[model samples]
Target: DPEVTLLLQCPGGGLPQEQIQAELSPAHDRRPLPGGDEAITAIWETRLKAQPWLFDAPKFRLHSATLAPIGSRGPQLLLRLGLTSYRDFLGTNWSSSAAWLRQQGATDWGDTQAYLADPLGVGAALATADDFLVFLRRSRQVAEAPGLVDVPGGHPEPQDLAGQLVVHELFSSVLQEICDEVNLPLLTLSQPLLLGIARNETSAGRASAEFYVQCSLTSEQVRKHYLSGGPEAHESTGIFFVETQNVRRLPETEMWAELCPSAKGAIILYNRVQGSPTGAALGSPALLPPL
Candidate 1:
């Protein structure tokens, strides 16, 4: 099943002909493969070129998935992120993606309008592991949730660095993450929904990708038993469903300070669940300043 619900993303690097020419050019005569620049420019070019449809289409493009673990009561009370989500270290503000793109002498970066046909210049998907991850952030026992963070299901492990898990591999990664960590029986993406994609220009990384996901299940199909691990899995003191209206206030304080567009998209999904369709469209109050 598609792991994530929304795919909020931004355009990334643009490789100069010189870079590719150098890679295939004679060994010593050519310069190193942007030896320092690790952005997957070539991959983006290849993916777009191979499937021009994504560039041509609107919301029908291939999307990634995530597993948003909601609470039981009504609206989900607490939400959690995978360990790998925090570990990726998007980079420092100075050498971030936007700075790096500019430093590499790139101009005409298309922002929100990038998906338009006549883009100023080509930018790759700032590229995150476009896959599905199970969200098991809440716990019935207040103390149990706090310990969950240090446990197996709490943190996400290192992702496959080799871009091995593309759109198709998303399912594989979701299932693998579930089984490898807690042996959860993920029935694949039975109900996949395209939440949306988020884009941002920051100092640390030129671009960051965000995908929000919701897994649908009948109460009858769900197993009430909880999985046990070590510390990471139970970081939260207790788990309970909170009113969606309450979560809307979370980003206000330091408690749930999520400035990333992905987090905002999550907020949107949460608001939608609360029957507030306009909330999701309101956009982030902080991230993208008034134009």
Candidate 2:
């Protein structure tokens, strides 16, 4: 039999084959770092186990908040869904706002508890757990739409008779919201990926904000399924992807306050995907106070 050979490279560069082979293999990374180089430690740990699913798994935090009527007197219990940020939005100083957000006293996006019990002059907001699923298929749309919001991927839905294999029930319900809001059927969806979850809160009416993540194939898939290749302005007005700055601008415009709870969720999700991670160590979680 021919001799089998392998090459190894150490951090400082070279470790001769004989020398490396002479010592026991250090129990396969069983020892702690002698000099904690965070970046190097992270690289090794990540290589040992990669979590692409953090970017793949598509679970969104559905916002459950009291909707203060824009022009009316009564408020209703509202579920704000679909939070996502886009790379295109990073421009126009969105990055600055994000940096400020990381600071301990910067901003509070979910502070809804203050008004949860009162609708007098304030409103309440909260979020629910929602699973996001993605799927793809080719289609022939007979017509073209003048204006639409395609989102460029498959839609979310719920159906009892749809011939889709729902691997995760509780999780699937999260994605089912897409179908529920848009009237799309679930039968056409496939390929579920569970992503990351982030909870953010601001005092803007006691809202508990949660943001989850997922991805679609292309903009066309989202357009075809939801838009049906027709104009969608009446429902959504327009569907081109916009930067976070533009998104922030929507609420100021005549449009649906696009900052509505659900819009906030989508916006947060998108920003999160594009935001850079802080280099500090992941901190120990603080336990919530008992009721």
Candidate 3:
């Protein structure tokens, strides 16, 4: 049986040039899937060429996974991120692809719409203790947008899959990310409160099941225990502790605008759960801001 529900699977082993072109055939078409050939390839390959630092970076090809409650209540959430290069897996989207094609003076304008949207899962943990919420500031060395306020998160990786036990991939990912990014120990956190997935649609497409975790750790505790220097310190400049009340009113705060859209959504979800009964379970999906 498949490990998790696959929204879209790359055909023929891995994502290759031919596979991409074949998928996005007939340039003038405007359908969703199997859309832009030259467009996708151009943008995808261009990023590969421009981002030389990512050329040798570790790439994780995501496999079957869940976007629901797990651990204690739900079954083991098993997902595999097949080892690959950033160039192969970090593909482009419809809007960006089409825009690039237009820039290149291509009138064919094959359907740049993405018929099949890939599930870009990111697990973010809202570590809160005492009265503050822990947040991380990205450094310039990061691959994606840097110098933005973000939560402890990342794509679920192989290290998250330890054995056949009833494992929670997102919860595991959150803990692992916290340890790596903040230099904190796993035992410092309690069993993460799993907030069900939130679907976020961006200019790229309707991609990403944003899984959130409410970790029991105060911002000061995290600052004290988790030394500034960690593996991700190269990519993360510093950690900030925002008051829980401030996060509750994050929408009005100047810091809210500085937050990455994903992080903002996760924080909103966390805030809602905290307000709800028990403050230990999932709630309605929070509305993600437009990117």
Candidate 4:
């Protein structure tokens, strides 16, 4: 399916600052290659020719996840991560034969994503103080989802380390992506409320953790900041904001046509969590600016 599949959600208006935790397991390392390393290399090889800026950077590969309402302490999201790379993802997940590769994994290891580079990506459904959710029109030059409307997100860099270190890198990097992509200050944003993990079937069900972040500035203010492009500015070409209304209606609207899987997933998770009356306390207030 092209739609996102919510793998897990941080329940009860999101976890307490200390509640969300992670544990990295080297034992959950990337499953053995399915005999196509050279093909994967060539995939990246041709990609670099078109997008010379593309890098075969190291990426965190998501192996498994556990979200328990009551851990040894309390609500927690413990994830197991291994290491992978852009080249591998392109060769496996992004490859045209990804479905066949996935079938082979299921047929062999009984896990669909067993042999693919299941890189852990992040997406932010950022909201402004004045009650609006932000979205971006991806630049036509991006390697994935070119010209599609998407949320701010990318893979969590491995930083070549182990355990909670990259876990910190995981959360911090989400904020960093916004800072570079949307030109927002870290101070202006709230701690991310991890909504859930969504799958991008377009990329062999590539996974992206979707989060909602409330910002201090309003939509107009965000637009002003977005105009001043920064480091990763070229990743997107335009910005959009919609009042946090009946988000359920969005999927039925024309806007859905332009939304990429990442954006759709963020909104779907947001609706499941934050858009509901119970979860609206995720920085949501009923107050509207004025007519």
Candidate 5:
């Protein structure tokens, strides 16, 4: 696909929480960008000088993912991750040298993106009760995908994990992002369905987990809640919803040009997975606990 390579997928009705697993190891930490640390630190400081709000924090770097069989039911997702930081991400993935780093890693580190920070980002394909799919216009002031339409999403945090299971945190983080950006209650949304993983081909194959979630409200109600504004409301400037079936034609419309890479990936996965046998029934997951 032009937007993302579907790395893993669960066909019918998406897998539940109990079917996922994760492993973190020090050996998986990102290797330094090939020439030196100069570019990495240099970019961080320069951006920091221009934008004081930016700060460094640790994030999970997804090194690998495997779908393994547990029994007759189906297979489980095994994510092998390691630690990376915001500072390092800006110096690598967001850095101008991002492509070069991947090129070097391909020849030297076994994996093309091993030398870059592949933070485990999460995005949601939210379907409202009335069947309209929701989307948001990002604030022009934001650093990435400014002024572009995007699905509700954000990077998962390492601080929140503390001691939680790695895959649980990854899955739950999608709900947190939705509640924050869309101004919805956690209780109003369904447990996230892991559609699969996608790479932001524009960002040197930046990887993000794509999820499907059903909401209890209509598009009108959802828009009102967004207008009320909750935490992180400033990140978006507008909210829009379209008929679920129309989503399949977005790429054919001029508006599609305004959708960000992540949104493109989410819609594509929703169409692909939802076409399967159990794909029609992806709602009614257990209500979530606050993150």
Candidate 6:
């Protein structure tokens, strides 16, 4: 549990800006990765013009946290995944690159190295209540796999930081997402455990480093609370209470077809770390695409 509890804060000083800057610099092929606040601002401007709808919403995304380790560290929190500029998720950058990508015959944006330069980090809460793991049936409002079963979480936002220096944005992100998506109060949930990380690449050309968290709530209580008034009436269609023991059987259910690759990857990664159900293995590669 210490491995899961710690590593949430940055080492000593502050945010790993220097390390992240190094990762974004230089390359053998294609364009160099953009770094610093200036470039991030420019990227956001481009995205805003191209996809005004994205900016119209209260939820804005940034390219924070590249692939960072999350297990075993200081006594406080887990490793900082990576902090990103808010402009990376905007389609404006994609629109600017569309012609070039077309020339390369690539359909997805993050499939290549250049695209990987601006990969986004998405967090999902893998909560447990009693004996079940909590899952959300996404509404049609979402752009990706709208009707799919997913955990409650999303990209970190500026509001998460609240203009303060923090060890890791992920811890704040999970709590914020839970509050937004499920209407749960922060105090009711347990300190989240970083289950694992995964690479999520969809046909839409969006690539992200997916972080999964294990909340302390029991399944029965979570379902009852959420269905009764925890914001499920609007944001989500329904919540599924999958028992921890029967989670391995999820892939065979009708709901399995509705689950996204990242959600499936979280399940596999969580099971791998806990070694629950003795020897449960991911049934197929399909369960964890690009991970």
RMSD of each: 17.0, 25.9, 11.2, 4.2, 6.3, 9.6
Could you give candidate 3's per-residue lDDT for residues 1-291 as a string of tens digits?
Answer: 111222432212112111111111133122222444454456566766876564434333333333223222333233433333332234433344534533333333332222322334454545465766678787776655578887777665433223332134544665677677777777766545544334333423323333334456666767865565655353567777876546667777788767766676566566554434332233334432222
- What would the per-residue lDDT of candidate 6 be over residues 1-291, giving only the tens digit for each residue? 111111122322223212322122122113433333355467667667878875532222222333345443424222222333334434323444533543343444443433333334455535464656778877787766787777776765434232233324545776777766666667776545554445443422333333444556666666666776745344778877776766756666677677776676666655555433222254444543332
Give the poorly placed runs of model 3, Cα more than 4 Å off: 1-44, 50-89, 98-117, 140-143, 158-167, 206-217, 228-234, 277-291
Collision pairs in model 3: 27-110, 28-110, 29-111, 32-114, 32-115, 33-115
- lDDT values for all models: 0.28, 0.27, 0.47, 0.78, 0.80, 0.49
Q: Which order, best to worst by lDDT?
A: 5, 4, 6, 3, 1, 2
Worst 10 residues of 4 by lDDT: 282-291
Estimated TM-score per prediction? 0.35, 0.28, 0.59, 0.87, 0.87, 0.59
lDDT at residue 75 of model 2 (Cα atoms): 24
Residue 23 error, candidate 2, Å: 51
- Report the candidate with higher lDDT, 4 versus 6: 4
Which digits, one per residue and each the tens of the lDDT, describe model 4 over residues 47-158?
Answer: 8999898777888888877887543565377777778887888788878898988898899989898889888899988888988888888778866778888888876786
lDDT of 3: 0.47
Estimate candidate 5's alpha-carbon lDDT, on a 0 to 1 scale: 0.80
Backbone clashes for every candidate come to 51, 37, 6, 0, 0, 21
What lDDT score goes with residue 88 in model 1?
Answer: 17
Clashes of 5: 0
Please list the residue runs of candidate 1 whose C-alpha ends up more than 4 Å from where it truly belongs after superposition.
1-100, 103-105, 108-166, 171-183, 188-190, 200-227, 232-241, 258-261, 269-275, 278-291
lDDT of 5 by residue, 60-112 (tens): 98888787663456446667788998888888888777887888888997788
Number of the candidate with higher lDDT, 5 or 6: 5
